[PDB]
Amino acid sequence: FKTDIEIAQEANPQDIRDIAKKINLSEDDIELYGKYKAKIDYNVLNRTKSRAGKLILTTAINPTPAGEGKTTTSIGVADALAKLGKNVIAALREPSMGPVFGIKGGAAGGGYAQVVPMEDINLHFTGDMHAIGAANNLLAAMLDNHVYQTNSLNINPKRITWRRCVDMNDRQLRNVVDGLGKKVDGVTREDGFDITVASEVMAAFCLSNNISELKENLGNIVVAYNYSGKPVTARDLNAHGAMAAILKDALKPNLVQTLEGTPAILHGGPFANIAHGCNSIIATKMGMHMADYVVTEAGFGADLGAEKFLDIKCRKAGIRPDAVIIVATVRALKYNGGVAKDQLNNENLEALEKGLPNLLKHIENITQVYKIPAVVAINRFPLDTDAELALVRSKCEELGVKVALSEVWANGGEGGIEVANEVLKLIEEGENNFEYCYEEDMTIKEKLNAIATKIYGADGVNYTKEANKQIAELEELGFGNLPVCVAKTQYSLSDDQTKLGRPTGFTIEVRQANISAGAGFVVVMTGEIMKMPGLPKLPAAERIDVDENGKISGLF
Amino acid sequence: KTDIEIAQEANPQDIRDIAKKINLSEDDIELYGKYKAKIDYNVLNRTKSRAGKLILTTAINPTPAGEGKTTTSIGVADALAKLGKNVIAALREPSMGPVFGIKGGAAGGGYAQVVPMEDINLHFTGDMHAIGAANNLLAAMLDNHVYQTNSLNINPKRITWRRCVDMNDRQLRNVVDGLGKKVDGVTREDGFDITVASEVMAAFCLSNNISELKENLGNIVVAYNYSGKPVTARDLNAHGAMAAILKDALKPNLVQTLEGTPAILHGGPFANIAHGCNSIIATKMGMHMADYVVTEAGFGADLGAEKFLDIKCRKAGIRPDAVIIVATVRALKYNGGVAKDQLNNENLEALEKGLPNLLKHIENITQVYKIPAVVAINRFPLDTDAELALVRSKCEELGVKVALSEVWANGGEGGIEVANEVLKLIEEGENNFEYCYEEDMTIKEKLNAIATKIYGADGVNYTKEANKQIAELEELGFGNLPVCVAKTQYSLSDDQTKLGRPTGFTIEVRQANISAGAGFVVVMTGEIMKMPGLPKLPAAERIDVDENGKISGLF
C-alpha cells in the first residue's frame, strides 16, 4: 500500500515540452511554468485545423459519504485510451487552494490514476485563482468608488449584490460592514466575502468561448440595482476591459500530465450547485481541437453535474458528448438500500436491489431524456462478490447499457481498458439523438418543472412567496430566456438529503432565485448554500511545514 | 518616444541566455515564459560566491515632479556592463493595485528600463498573491482560534493583525466582520491594507533563507491576550503553512534591462512603515552571482538609505562599498523657493538655497556612515553650465565628485561617467562603515540618534500615548530592535513644507508599533495611509483587450 503522494513522488514525469509534442503543440504555442507545467495559447485555435475530437463525459451516481471517485475514472480512461494508441486529452478542473488548509488536501484523482505535479496543483498552480479573485475584487473596488465619487448611476447601496472574494475558508468575512470611518473612507454599507471559486467571475471564466466573449460576459455581470429597479452592470462601471486584462493569461488552459504521460488540461473550477461544476469551455474546445478524444467530467451526480454540463455548457459551447461514463460502486448502491457506513463490506443482495434504482434512474436520464450512449463503470472493490456484480449487470442490461469493471485506482490505464473499449464501441456504433431537457423559449418555472419531473423524478415544483416575487422580477428584466442552475443537495435526487435510492412522491421547494448574467444562467436555490466555508477546530495548516531546503511536508 | 514604445521596440533575449551570463544552469531556474525565471535559492548552498561588491543608489528628498532614482540604478548597471563587468541590478517589484487607479508605469524610464514591462506591472511571477494569501491565512486562523476556543485568551479589541488585498480599495480600510449567526465568527472591528503594506512583506524581504522566513513569520505578533502578553503566529501554529505558501515566492525573479544586463526583481515594502528595499535574498543572490550589484532604496537618503544601512545591512551582514546620490537641478531649485512651473528658467540664487539639502545627504553618507559617495546629476537640456558648475563646486568642498548622467535618453552610455567614479571609489577598498546607533540603546535613544545625526533635529518629542506604547514595548523586550521611522519624505523634518535644510525643528512622535516578524519598531510622526484610494476616473476604465488578447491602455 502506497499513499497517493508516495506514488506521485515515485513516478517519472516527462518534460512538458514533450507532452505538448504529443498533441502537436510547438514551443511558440505554449508558455512554460517550470518544466512540468505550461499554458496553451488559445490563439492556436485560429492558426491550426481542428481534429474534431470526440467528447466523453464522465459522471456518477448521487454522491455517497466515502466514495466520490469520478476523477479517478476519468484519468484512468484517458490513460487507457493512450495505451490503445489513441490521441487523447484529459480535461479536468483545478481545485481550490482554500480547503487545503482546512481539511487535508488530496491528489487530482487517486492511486495510480493521478495528475502531476500534485503539489503545485493544490497550491498556486499557474495563478488562475489569483487572477479571478483580483478581477472580482477590482470590480468591487470600482463599484464602491463610483458610489463614493458621484453615484451618477443612482445605485442603491442596500441593493448591491456583488460580493468580494478570498481564496480562504474564512467564516469571519461572510457578513461584514465596511466603508466606516472618515468621509474619505467610503460609503458605509453591508457587504460580504465568498470563496474565490464561488465568484460569478469563475462561472463566466469557464463559459467563454474566447477572450472577446469573456470581456462581453464580464460586462454583463449585474452588480447592483438602481433606485428605479434597473440592473447596474460591470459595463456601466467601465470595468470589464480591466477585468479581462487581469484574466488574459489565466484564460490560457494549463497543460499537465497523468502518471503515464497522457496529456491533461486543468482549467477552471466553479461550484456544482450554484454553478455548472465543469471545467472551462476553452479547455474542452482546445482538447477537441488538438486531440481525437477528450475525457472530461462534471461535479456531483448525473442529476446535477451532467444536467448542467448538457443543458448549460454544451448549449453555450455548441458541442455534444458522444458517450457518457456513469461511475458507481457496489458499496454506494448498498448505501442507498439502508446499509450503514460501517456494514458496507458485507454481502447484501437485498439492499443492493433497493439502492440500484438510483443507478437505473441516471441511466434512463442519459439514454432516454438526452439520448446519449452510456456505459456503467463499476469501481470494483476486493470484497465485491460475483453475485453482486452480476445483479448490477443484469438490471442494467434491461436498459440496454453494458457494465464494465474498472480497476484504475490500483492498476492505472490497464484497469480502464474495458471501460475505454466500450466507449469506443459506443462512439463508432450506437445512435446519438442528443436532446436538451428544455428549450430557451420556456419560462423559468417551465424550465424548473422540466428538470424536476424528467431528471429528478418529482411531481412538481413549489415556490415560496419570495421566490415568486424574485422570479417575476427576473422575467420583467428579460432574464427568463436563460438556462437555470438548480442549487440543491447532491446526496439525493430530491431536495431532502435523506431520501436515498429513488424517491417518487415528492416535490421541490424553491426559496430563492438570483441572476448570474455574466455566466448566463439563473441560480435557483432549493436550500441554504455555503459560499464561504469555515475552518475546523484543528486546521490542516497546523501540520504543514517547510524544511531548510524548501521542501513541504504535511500537505497530505 | 514613450517608455512603452522603447520597451516594445526592444529585442529581449531568452531568459535562459541571460541566466548563462551569470553561470546559471537549466536546473537552477524555473521559467515563467521565455522572458522571466525564478532562481532556486538553494544555489546559494551548493555553489561558491563571487563575493560581489554592493552599490547602493539613493537620492535627495523627493520632489512632486522628477523621480529618476530607479532610472539611474538601471543606467549605471548597463554602464558597468559596457565596461566588461559582471553586474546585476537588484530592484523592487511594484504593486499591481495602483495600476488600476493612476497609470501603470515602466521599471525605470527612457532607455533605462527593465523588460517585460507589462508582466512586471501585473501578476509577474505571483509573489504578491503569495504574500497576500499568507497574510490572509494567518488572519483566518487567528479569528478561527478565537471562535473555536480562544484558549490563548486573545482580546479581540487588541488584535493588531489586518487582512490585505492588492487593490486600492478605500472601502476596506475600516470594517466590522464576524456578523450574522453564531456560526459566522466573533464580531469585531477589522481592516484591510494593501498587500505591500503587510508585515509579511517586510519579513519576506528581511529573511536570509527559507528557515529564517519561517522563524520570522512565527515571531509575528498578531494580538495581545487579556494579560497584556503578545500572541504570535507561532502560538497559532501558522508560520509553517505561511512559509509553504511562500516557498516559491522567496525565489528571486530574473529579468533583464533593455541592453541585456541581468536584473533581479524581488519584494517591495513601503519605505515609511517599512525599510523600502528589495529582498535580502535578491541582494545576496546578486552578490553571489555577480561581481557588482546595483540596488536602491525608496524615498530619499534620510529614509531609504537610513533603513537600508541600519536595518537591512545589519540583518543581512553586508555593507555597501559605494553610494550613488541622485539629484537634479530642477529639484534643488524647488528646494530654493521656485514653483513647479518656473523650474525651466535659470536661477543660480535658488540653486544655492536648495543645495544644502544635497549637502546634508552627502554629510550623512560620508561622515555618519563613512561610505564613499558620488553624486549623479540627471542632466536636463535646459540645465546651464553655470548651474552644473555650482552644484559641482559645493560638492567638491565635501570631497565628493559630481558625475553627469544621461541614461534616460542614451542608456548605458549615459552612465559611464557615473560608473567610472563608482569603480574608482571601489578600487580603494577603505571600509569604515558605521551604523547610526547600536542595538543596546533604547527606543528613545535610537530615535534621538536618527533625528539629530540624519534629520538634523534638536531632539524628539513624544505624546503621552507614544510614551505609553514605547514603555509597553520596552517591558515586553522589543527595545533591542531597530527603529523604522514613518515620517514624510518631502522634507528632512516631519513637516512637508520645510524644504531645503531645516535647522530649528523637533520631531513629534505620536504612535509606536511592533513588527516582530520583520524585526523592527515602527514609529510614526503622523498618519500613514496603508490602503490607497481610487480617483474619480480610474485608469482601469481605459484598459482594454483586443480579439487576440493584446492589452491596451495600461500606460
Residue numbers in the entry:
A (entry chain C): 3 to 558
B (entry chain A): 4 to 558
Give me lines lifted from the publication on this model:
FtfL is a key enzyme in C1 metabolism pathway. It catalyzes the synthesis of formyltetrahydrofolic acid from formic acid and tetrahydrofolic acid. Formyltetrahydrofolic acid is then converted through two reactions to 5,10-methylene tetrahydrofolic acid, a metabolite for biosynthesis of pyrimidines and amino acids. PaFtfL exhibits a tetramer in all three crystal structures, consistent with other reported FtfL crystal structures.
To further investigate the structural mechanism of FtfL inhibition by BBR, we determined the crystal structures of PaFtfL apo enzyme, PaFtfL complexed with its substrate ATP, as well as PaFtfL complexed with BBR at 2.0 Å, 2.3 Å, and 2.6 Å resolutions, respectively. Protomers A/B and protomers C/D form two stable dimers with an interface area of 2100 Å2, and the two dimers assemble into a tetramer with an additional interface area of 620 Å2. Each protomer comprises its own solvent-exposed active site close to the protomer interface. Structural comparison reveals that PaFtfL adopts essentially the same overall fold for each of the protomers and exhibits an identical active site as in reported crystal structures of FtfL from other bacterial species, indicative its conserved catalytic mechanism.
